[PDB]
Design a protein around this ligand. Structure first.
Ligand SMILES: CCCCCCCCCCCCCCCCCC(=O)OC[C@H](COP(=O)([O-])OCC(O)COP(=O)([O-])OC[C@@H](COC(=O)CCCCCCCCCCCCCCCCC)OC(=O)CCCCCCCCCCCCCCCCC)OC(=O)CCCCCCCCCCCCCCCCC
Ligand SMILES: CCCCCCCC/C=C/CCCCCCCC(=O)OC[C@H](COP(=O)(O)OCCN)OC(=O)CCCCCCC/C=C/CCCCCCCC
Ligand SMILES: CN(C)C(=N)NC(=N)N
Ligand code: SF4
Ligand code: SF4
Ligand code: SF4
Ligand code: SF4
Ligand code: FES
Ligand SMILES: [Mg+2]
Ligand SMILES: [Zn+2]
Lengths: 376, 176, 112, 124, 97, 96, 230, 114, 208, 48
């Protein structure tokens, strides 16, 4: 189904076209990612996180890296942290473009889809320049980032950010004050603050319902405590308010990107500890200790001290969490992935009470579900 | 800090009420959207003329694999199996034995390109730059079996793309 | 006074002080049935008397909200209702009794 | 709280096929130290693994194929009693191998230079 | 970009903004595809002296969790997991949209 | 340095060649067998031997950080050449 | 009678004549080692097993120092860690960069103890040492640039196999292990020198280059070539 | 040792639940054959229900019986609601699996399997 | 400066320890243990039948307003008598904190459903049942959520094979997708990676 | 090459009508370019 994102079976009971109940049948994209992660090492399990929410890829990588570094008791260097924050905001822009345009396409509008996907193409070029892969970069790793930026990336990112607010403005010219869009979205999928908190919603759902909560502000990670930005807050808790929150979050991510570009520091890109991050190729090819550590890291992997951690980040779709359990070996004993869309899709049935088929389509769009992360 | 996305109230003066009534009766914002789409109609399209034009790529791009050689012609791979150990998807199968001249060289080197996830760990783990991910990405086949590369196929890819592979590695080897 | 609380589904109360006093008094009455030595009773009685003293001391809503540090006055009332329901349930559960059962010998060992 | 005078058995709930429930003999053992290294950190936990089954050669590409779901399955247990309890409740047959620890040895550097004993070394 | 002056005027009038100021097509304003060779820094642990791994070992400083209370093993004020979160301030840059 | 089997099938540098009675040769009918023509063993044999006047020499394969790990070869045995085993390169001391 | 010693403050009763290494083994701590094998004699020359006694100004060789009454053995002390780092630095300073072409590969004690007890960086800015390779028959392949002069093969040869054709010739940094003549170390117990060599200097020639330790599956069976039943 | 019962306390109540589940499955086979357009007979479906019930006849723990009837109710509701397809219903019948030999001589001929 | 070592927060450590003592005093009937990890995470080990009282206290109490259920999973540890370890991750927005509550259970022992305290527990407990076999007593609708229809076995258990026991293909004779025993063209190559040299002395266990 | 066109359209190739032994008058592939011109066209370098 075009509106079902490919791998959702929504068993719906309809009285006429009014929706009597929704019974989301998921697992059509369940792969066994957690079992496979148990069978891989810590470096081999990074692309699995790359492919979970395949619209916020560097965000998933950052969450996994933060969890592993917390268990390892190491600290990424400042330049690595600033690169992580910059690309996390670029990833947030990518994800919010995808969310808004696909929501508007399920409504019926396609020109914004095409425009903002041209912008997505430019950001994909940035991804490919740093990493060599257009989406599944596998660039953010425990201990920092894999490689340093090429010598024109910051200038090109500055140009892109310079010419992007106009694209957001053109997007808003077609949707914000359009009475058809307002009729389709206003007072659709209203969720109260208490209901959102109990059902376990996070991120844009809470902010649209009016709860003042954001992990980047309350529980900062990396260098998010050194950047200034505003947290959009909704009032009516409906699709229109969540759309406004997402657009304003795109603008605030532009703010953060500008600050990162101006404040990028010099230095190294990974923790200067060859027992966790690999040494450089020249050191590997000239130094015996470096060659030994390269061999051991790429065959067995670093050992992680035993323990369990739950680390969460403010991914573009809400709170993305990882509960990682290590038994002192080079391979993770347990890895539970908390995708924010799981709870939202669980709450889909309540939000669609007393609505119609088109309303349910709009509600799915405003929840912004990725079934890769839902099913894992 | 935080901001309210939608908490403004409209003024109730007669001029503003008349303006809103005119917007309701005369579809002002609808005409505005029409004007935006007309502007995009008169702008320049952003389409490249594939296959006669190609999108930009970088020296870091990960495409089809290749096995390199030394400038003397000797194969770089020494059957160390680091790439096989580090491969996330277990796409590499390597079997080796001493050669006739006593070198440590591979007899079997298979990559299942239907199992590979094109992550580039193998070229990071290689201590002699033998296995690389070349710039080629247009290698789609008509049968599944043709995607099960072996040592002869990978060596042919390396010999065919050696110049471009060497140029890319020269460009990007100072960042590694 | 204020038009909205800013939270969907949470209405504004015209009489915050009286409602808060009623809820705190009900909470204190319910806690009187819990045994005196129960650790639950002492702490919640302390916090309720601390918050009941504030509501009877500050007539201004904004100053009272600043003093309580519990968000808005409607949020404070909702939290009082939740605390009252929890007090009733804890009276039913009786969790001050000694431990039900110690776990097996190696039940929380890690790594293992 | 009911009382059952029965042995625990969850074979009907595990979902394993009857063939792999009945015809499988797991081996509970402590792994032997790899002779190539002097470390002894891999000889501390009991392991449970299944008997080897057939592996043949794939006609295409010559890979090694298998039909045994439990070929790569190895479980780690802290104690022999725990391992045996798990094997019994899951219904597989089992063979238990007692742990082998090196016996204490009397070492003395001064024995290398004995006045009249054969322990004197001819080199250093 | 390459366009007629009348077409540019019609685009500006219809869109309401000066499009040439913010173009979505890149005309020679991007960085060159060939760059001078870089020289990346080394790091903080590349010293030849006073640099012992025992003093910069993150993993070996990890400790098992501290057992605050175990079953096997005055008037205290009631406490909270953390001090209550302070109320957010309304943005000065743009409080309302 | 490709070689032809008695069945008309090319022999790979690893010696692979399907037997006469092997049924697996059917996959090559109406199609071709992928064999690389260049043989690394032949090329490295074609390479000459570098004479250096030192007891120990170092090889990194050429290119520095683009070669292989640097290794040291001891040129003391006069009955044979010292071979860098990463790149199979032979070195010798000036005799006579 | 047993004497009481302390390992990291934990009491343990050991027989007199027990070494520091064996006391730590009894309390469950395995001290790093290269030249110590429990089946061979005590040599004490690699110096990898140095530990600190609580009041002693000088670190002692754990593999050869008998314990005295009331000693506190600080296994993970700063002096012990620094001693291990220094010894590993010297070893890896002269070792060759042969890990990818080395059969020892992923089952090397030099690699594992370097990753656990040594530093992560190199300060050696000089040239390395290259040693001529010897030939001792068709079973054992010798690449003696990887030798760390631990004298395990010498002690094993003489003591266990009763064959005294292995030793050290020369002295100083140019010390070499070999027969000094073209002699084959042929004996019924030769591959055990392949097993006990902690580095890749002595490796199996039939097994050369075929596999890596992490790939292989280990099956515990018995031997049928003779009636001992190994 | 007293253990927390899932349901049924003793074994007789577990048998009662088993009989209720068997009746529910017995009255569902005609509707299943009709809706899924199965080419099998109603007698074949009832026989398969009987066979799947009989393979657990050796259970003597009431908690295991309770879990079995819970799973049976789950897979019955997957059939009444037509969540399952014809594919799964016919997966119950192993219509494509080749008959594995069971005698020692045939097993010896085919391969190394015990 | 120690740039490569994570800085520690003793203030947060002390706050978490104090709150752990507080809750352990308040609920002595169920709480068996309280721990604080050195990266400042509070962990509470309770008796399995105290799930509802402990969670209701942690949600409604004024000094612990853990209004959000961040996660709910289980861990399979075969070596234990009660192999399954149920973990609840709670987030308190009022005090900007997070807590963890862990209980234990085995194959045949049910755990009371917490859908009456948190509504996310519905799908979380359905997933726990689907992937581990743990039964939840008063669940509104307990069934498989992720596995295929009619799938037998609970995949996330340690004793379940990675590739399972069955695989799917389309059979032309019967004109439908069929399930057949698993058969791999290339067997998964199991690697023994653990080094035989102990890495972390701080976690060393007694020889016993 | 035409630098006046926007990035991506500034370089292009007109394929031949016969390569090796196949007539490519209408059937033109993206893999018909040698590796050096492939790099030049995909803009991994600015030097032809
Ligand atoms: C009715 C309009 C008739 C005139 C017309 O088409 O004018 C197009 C002409 C296109 O100007 P433009 O969009 O600036 O062209 C982009 C660049 O100048 C760059 O333009 P270019 O180099 O791509 O131009 C190539 C050239 C030749 O292009 C072709 O031959 C391809 C298209 C053939 C169409 C038949 O195009 C023309 O000759 C355009 C006119 C085609 C008339 C049909 O527009 C005007 O002259 C203004 C029209 C204002 C209308 C209100
Ligand atoms: C012949 C060519 C005509 C071409 C016209 C093209 C116009 C532009 C085309 C784009 C529009 C097409 C998509 C838009 C479809 C939907 C448009 C729409 O919504 O219009 C309805 C619009 C919206 O209503 P709501 O916002 O929902 O408010 C309801 C409150 N309960 O309401 C309308 O009815 C407007 C319809 C136009 C009314 C005509 C104006 C009346 C003015 C009267 C003055 C003249 C009086 C005559 C007497 C003269 C006395 C001297
Ligand atoms: C497959 N994914 C991720 C989609 N978003 N699909 C879609 N049709 N919108
Ligand atoms: S790119 Fe990654 S998945 Fe592909 S062969 Fe290399 S290591 Fe394996
Ligand atoms: S990592 Fe390189 S040298 Fe080692 S086996 Fe792979 S391709 Fe060969
Ligand atoms: S002996 Fe060990 S450290 Fe030396 S080259 Fe071989 S694997 Fe590497
Ligand atoms: S060859 Fe091996 S066993 Fe002999 S002294 Fe050298 S390192 Fe030790
Ligand atoms: S092991 Fe003691 S000095 Fe070598
Ligand atoms: Mg050896
Ligand atoms: Zn070389």
């Amino acid at each position: 189904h075009p509106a079902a994102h490919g791998v959702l079976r929504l068993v719906m009971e309809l009285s006429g076209e009014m929706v009597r109940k929704c019974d989301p049948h998921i697992g059509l994209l369940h792969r066994g990612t957690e079992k496979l992660i148990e069978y891989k090492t810590y470096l081999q399990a990074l692309p699995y996180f790359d492919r979970l929410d395949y619209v916020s890829m560097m965000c998933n990588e950052q969450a996994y890296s933060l969890a592993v570094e917390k268990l390892l008791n190491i600290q990424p260097p400042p330049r690595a942290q600033w690169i992580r924050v910059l690309f996390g905001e670029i990833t947030r822009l990518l994800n919010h473009i995808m969310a808004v345009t696909t929501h508007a396409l399920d409504i019926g509008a396609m020109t914004p889809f095409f425009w903002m996907f041209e912008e997505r193409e430019k950001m994909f070029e940035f991804y490919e320049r740093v990493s060599g892969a257009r989406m599944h970069a596998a660039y953010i790793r425990p201990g920092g980032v894999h490689q340093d930026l090429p010598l024109g990336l910051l200038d090109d990112i500055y140009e892109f950010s310079k010419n992007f607010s106009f694209r957001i403005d053109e997007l808003e010219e077609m949707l914000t004050n359009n009475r058809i869009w307002r009729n389709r979205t206003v007072d659709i999928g209203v969720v109260t603050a208490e209901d959102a908190l109990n059902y376990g919603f996070s991120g844009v759902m809470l902010r649209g319902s009016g709860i003042q909560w954001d992990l980047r502000k309350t529980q900062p990670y990396d260098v998010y405590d050194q950047v200034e930005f505003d947290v959009p807050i909704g009032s009516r808790g409906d699709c229109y308010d969540r759309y406004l929150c997402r657009v304003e979050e795109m603008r605030q991510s532009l703010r953060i990107i500008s600050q990162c570009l101006n404040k990028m520091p010099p230095g190294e890109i990974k923790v200067d500890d060859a027992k966790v991050s690999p040494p450089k190729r020249a050191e590997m090819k000239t130094s015996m200790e470096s060659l030994i550590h390269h061999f051991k890291l790429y065959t067995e992997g670093y050992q992680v001290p035993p323990g369990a951690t739950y680390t969460a980040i403010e991914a573009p779709k809400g709170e993305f969490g990882v509960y990682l359990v290590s038994d002192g070996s080079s391979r993770p004993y347990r890895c539970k992935i908390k995708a924010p869309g799981f709870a939202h899709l669980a709450g889909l049935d309540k939000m669609s009470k007393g609505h119609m088929l088109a309303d349910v389509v709009a509600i799915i769009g405003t929840q912004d579900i990725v079934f890769g992360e839902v099913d894992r | 800090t935080y901001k309210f996305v939608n908490m403004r109230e409209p003024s109730m003066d007669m001029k503003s009420v008349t303006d809103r009534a005119a917007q309701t009766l005369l579809w002002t914002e609808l005409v505005r959207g029409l004007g935006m789409t007309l502007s995009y109609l008169f702008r320049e399209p952003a389409t490249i003329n594939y296959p006669f034009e190609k999108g930009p790529l970088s020296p870091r791009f990960r495409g089809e694999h290749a096995l390199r050689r030394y400038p003397s012609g000797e194969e770089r791979c020494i059957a160390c199996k680091l790439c096989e150990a580090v491969c996330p998807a277990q796409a590499i199968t390597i079997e080796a034995e001493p050669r006739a001249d006593g070198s440590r060289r591979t007899t079997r080197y298979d990559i299942d390109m239907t199992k590979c996830i094109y992550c580039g760990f193998c070229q990071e783990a290689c201590p002699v730059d033998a296995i690389v991910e070349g710039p080629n990405f247009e290698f789609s086949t008509e049968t599944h079996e043709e995607l099960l590369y072996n040592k002869e196929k990978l060596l042919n890819n390396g010999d065919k793309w050696e110049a471009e592979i060497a140029a890319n590695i020269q460009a990007d080897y100072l960042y590694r | 006074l204020k038009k909205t609380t800013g939270l969907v589904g949470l209405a504004v109360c015209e009489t915050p002080h009286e409602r808060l006093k009623i809820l705190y008094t009900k909470i204190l009455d319910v806690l009187g049935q819990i045994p005196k030595n129960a650790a639950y009773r002492k702490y919640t009685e302390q916090i309720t008397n601390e918050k009941l003293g504030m509501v009877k001391a500050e007539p201004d809503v904004k100053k009272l909200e600043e003093q309580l540090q519990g968000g808005q006055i409607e949020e404070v009332i909702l939290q009082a209702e939740n605390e009252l329901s929890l007090a009733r349930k804890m009276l039913r559960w009786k969790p001050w009794e000694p431990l039900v059962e110690e776990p097996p010998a190696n039940q929380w060992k890690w790594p293992i | 709280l009911i009382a059952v005078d029965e042995k625990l058995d969850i074979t009907t709930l595990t979902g394993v096929p009857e063939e792999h429930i009945k015809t499988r003999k797991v081996r509970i053992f402590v792994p032997a130290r790899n002779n190539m290294q002097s470390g002894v950190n891999n000889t501390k936990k009991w392991k449970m693994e299944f008997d080897t089954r057939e592996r043949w050669e794939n006609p295409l590409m010559g890979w090694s194929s298998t039909a045994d779901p439990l070929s790569n399955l190895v479980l780690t247990f802290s104690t022999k009693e725990d391992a045996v309890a798990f094997a019994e409740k899951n219904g597989w047959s089992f063979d238990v191998e007692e742990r082998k620890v090196p016996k204490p040895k009397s070492k003395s550097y001064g024995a290398n230079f004995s006045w009249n004993k054969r322990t004197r070394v001819s080199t250093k | 970009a390459s366009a007629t002056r009348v077409i540019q005027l019609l685009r500006n009038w219809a869109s309401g903004r000066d499009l040439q100021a913010k173009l979505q097509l890149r005309y020679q304003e991007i960085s060159k595809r060939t760059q001078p060779p870089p020289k990346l820094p080394v790091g903080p642990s590349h010293k030849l002296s006073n640099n012992y791994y025992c003093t910069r070992d993150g993993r070996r400083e990890a400790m098992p969790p501290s057992i605050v209370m175990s079953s096997q093993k005055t008037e205290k004020k009631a406490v909270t997991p953390a001090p209550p979160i302070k109320r957010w301030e309304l943005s000065k840059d743009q409080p309302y949209l | 340095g490709v070689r032809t089997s008695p069945t008309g099938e090319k022999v790979t540098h690893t010696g692979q060649a399907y037997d006469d009675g092997d049924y697996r040769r059917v996959r090559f009918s109406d199609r071709q067998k992928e064999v690389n023509e260049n043989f690394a063993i032949d090329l490295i044999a074609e390479q000459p031997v570098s004479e250096v006047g030192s007891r120990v020499i170092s090889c990194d394969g050429g290119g520095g950080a683009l070669g292989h790990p640097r290794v040291y070869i001891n040129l003391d045995k006069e009955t044979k050449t010292g071979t860098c085993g990463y790149c199979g390169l032979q070195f010798r001391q000036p005799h006579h | 009678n047993l004497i009481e010693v302390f390992v990291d403050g934990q009491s343990v009763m050991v027989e007199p004549g027990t070494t520091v290494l064996q006391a730590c083994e009894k309390v469950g701590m395995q001290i790093p080692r290269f030249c110590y094998h429990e089946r061979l004699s005590v040599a004490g020359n690699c110096r990898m097993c140095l530990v600190e006694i609580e009041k002693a100004p000088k670190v002692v060789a754990a593999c050869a120092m008998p314990v005295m009454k009331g000693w506190n053995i600080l296994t993970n002390s700063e002096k012990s860690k620094k001693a291990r780092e220094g010894v590993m630095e010297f070893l890896l300073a002269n070792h060759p960069l042969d890990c990818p072409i080395c059969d020892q590969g992923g089952e090397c004690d030099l690699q594992d103890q370097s990753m656990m007890f040594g530093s992560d960086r190199s300060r050696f800015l000089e040239g390395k040492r290259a040693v001529e390779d010897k030939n001792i028959g068709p079973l054992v392949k010798t690449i003696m640039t990887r030798c760390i002069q631990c004298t395990r093969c010498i002690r094993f040869a003489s003591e266990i196999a009763g064959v005294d054709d292995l030793g050290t010739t020369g002295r100083g940094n140019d010390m070499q292990v070999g027969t000094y003549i073209e002699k084959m170390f042929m004996s019924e117990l030769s591959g055990n020198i392949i097993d006990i060599c902690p580095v890749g200097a002595l490796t199996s020639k039939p097994y050369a280059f075929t596999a890596r330790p992490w790939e292989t599956r280990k099956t515990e069976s018995i031997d049928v070539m003779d009636a001992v039943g190994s | 040792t007293s253990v927390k019962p899932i349901f049924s306390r003793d074994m007789n109540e577990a048998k009662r639940r088993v009989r209720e589940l068997y009746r529910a499955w017995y009255r569902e086979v005609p509707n299943t054959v009709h809706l899924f357009q199965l080419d099998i007979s109603v007698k074949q479906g009832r026989d398969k229900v009987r066979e799947m019930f009989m393979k657990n006849a050796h259970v003597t723990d009431p908690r295991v019986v309770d879990l079995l009837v819970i799973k049976g109710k789950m897979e019955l509701e997957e059939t009444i609601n037509v969540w399952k397809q014809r594919t799964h219903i016919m997966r119950f019948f192993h219509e494509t699996e080749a008959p594995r030999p069971t005698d020692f001589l045939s097993k010896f001929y085919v391969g190394h399997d015990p | 400066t120690r740039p490569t070592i994570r800085p520690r927060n003793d203030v947060v450590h002390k706050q978490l320890s104090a709150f752990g003592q507080y809750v352990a005093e308040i609920l002595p009937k169920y709480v068996q243990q309280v721990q604080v990890s050195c990266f400042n995470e509070l962990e509470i080990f309770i008796h399995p039948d105290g799930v509802i009282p402990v969670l209701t206290f942690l949600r409604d109490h004024t000094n612990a307003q853990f209004k959000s259920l961040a996660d709910l999973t289980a861990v399979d540890v075969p070596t234990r008598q009660n192999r399954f370890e149920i973990v609840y991750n709670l987030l308190s927005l009022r005090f900007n904190s997070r807590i963890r509550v862990k209980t234990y259970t085995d194959e045949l022992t049910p755990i009371e459903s917490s859908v009456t305290v948190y509504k996310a527990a519905n799908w979380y407990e359905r997933e726990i049942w689907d992937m581990f076999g743990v039964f939840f007593a008063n669940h509104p609708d307990l069934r498989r959520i992720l596995t295929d229809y009619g799938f037998e076995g609970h995949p996330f258990r340690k004793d379940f094979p990675l590739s399972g026991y069955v695989e799917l293909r389309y059979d032309d004779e019967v004109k439908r997708v069929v399930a057949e025993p698993v058969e791999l063209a290339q067997e998964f190559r199991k690697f023994d990676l653990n080094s035989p040299w102990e890495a972390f002395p701080a976690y060393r266990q007694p020889p016993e | 090459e035409d630098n006046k066109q926007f990035f991506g359209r500034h370089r292009w190739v007109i394929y031949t009508t016969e390569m090796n032994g196949r007539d490519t008058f209408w059937d033109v592939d993206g893999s018909m370019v040698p590796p050096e011109w492939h790099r030049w066209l995909h803009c991994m370098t600015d030097d032809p």
